[PDB]
From Swiss-Prot:
The keyword Acetylation applies. Induction: Down-regulated during differentiation of cultured colon adenocarcinoma cells. GO terms for cellular component: cytoplasm; cytosol; extracellular exosome; nucleoplasm; nucleus; protein-containing complex; UBC13-MMS2 complex; ubiquitin conjugating enzyme complex. Highly expressed in thyroid, pancreas, spinal cord, lymph node, trachea, adrenal gland, bone marrow and pancreas. Detected at low levels in heart, breast, placenta, brain, liver, kidney, stomach and lung. It comes from Homo sapiens. InterPro entries: UBQ-conjugat_E2_core, UBQ-conjugating_enzyme/RWD. GO terms for biological process: cell differentiation; error-free postreplication DNA repair; positive regulation of canonical NF-kappaB signal transduction; positive regulation of DNA-templated transcription; positive regulation of intracellular signal transduction; positive regulation of protein K63-linked ubiquitination; postreplication repair; protein K63-linked ubiquitination. GO terms for molecular function: ubiquitin conjugating enzyme activity; ubiquitin conjugating enzyme binding. This is Ubiquitin-conjugating enzyme E2 variant 1. Keywords: Acetylation, Nucleus, Ubl conjugation pathway.
């Protein structure tokens, strides 16, 4: 309740007209959200430790960082699919505003996704759902889990796979 009254006062003739008032105002919304580094640390353990059938793994690139930017995402192929029985490496960049906005994900290995290029592996957030409508509950595991989920679908599980699990860069 912004105002200019606490208890007492003095001098007051017009209690309706403006006369001369200048209250400090600008914004009209607060900023609520879960800590960024927190998700990284908590998710760092969950990813490094392991997941259901180890379908993916979101570990750290350099075990000597602070904000944990250069991430690494592993992925396994699901039986009964073009990708089935095929590992996949990834690198997720998370800097300014990560769990609050679409991260910069890029496949290191050789992968072919409708939203991910077949040269560098830059995962386009326009194609990826989790990235398009990125939320606060999303994380690296969600990114890896979601993208891989599409790979299992008929859409991505039809594209021609590479003749090896080599990376994209030398």
């Amino acid at each position: 309740m912004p105002g200019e009254v606490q208890a007492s006062y003095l001098k007051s003739q017009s209690k309706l007209s403006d006369e001369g008032r200048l209250e400090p105002r600008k914004f009209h919304c607060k900023g609520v959200k879960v800590p960024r580094n927190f998700r990284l640390l908590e998710e760092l353990e969950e990813g490094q430790k392991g997941v259901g059938d180890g379908t993916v793994s979101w570990g750290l690139e350099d075990d000597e960082d602070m904000t944990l930017t250069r991430w690494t995402g592993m992925i396994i192929g699901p039986p009964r699919t073009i990708y089935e029985n095929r590992i996949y490496s990834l690198k997720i960049e998370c800097g300014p505003k990560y769990p609050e906005a679409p991260p910069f994900v890029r496949f290191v290995t050789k992968i072919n996704m409708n939203g991910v290029n077949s040269s560098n592996g830059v995962v386009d957030p326009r194609a990826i759902s989790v990235l398009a409508k990125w939320q606060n509950s999303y994380s690296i595991k969600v990114v890896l889990q979601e993208l891989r989920r599409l790979m299992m679908s008929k859409e991505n599980m039809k594209l021609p796979q590479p003749p090896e699990g080599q990376c994209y860069s030398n």
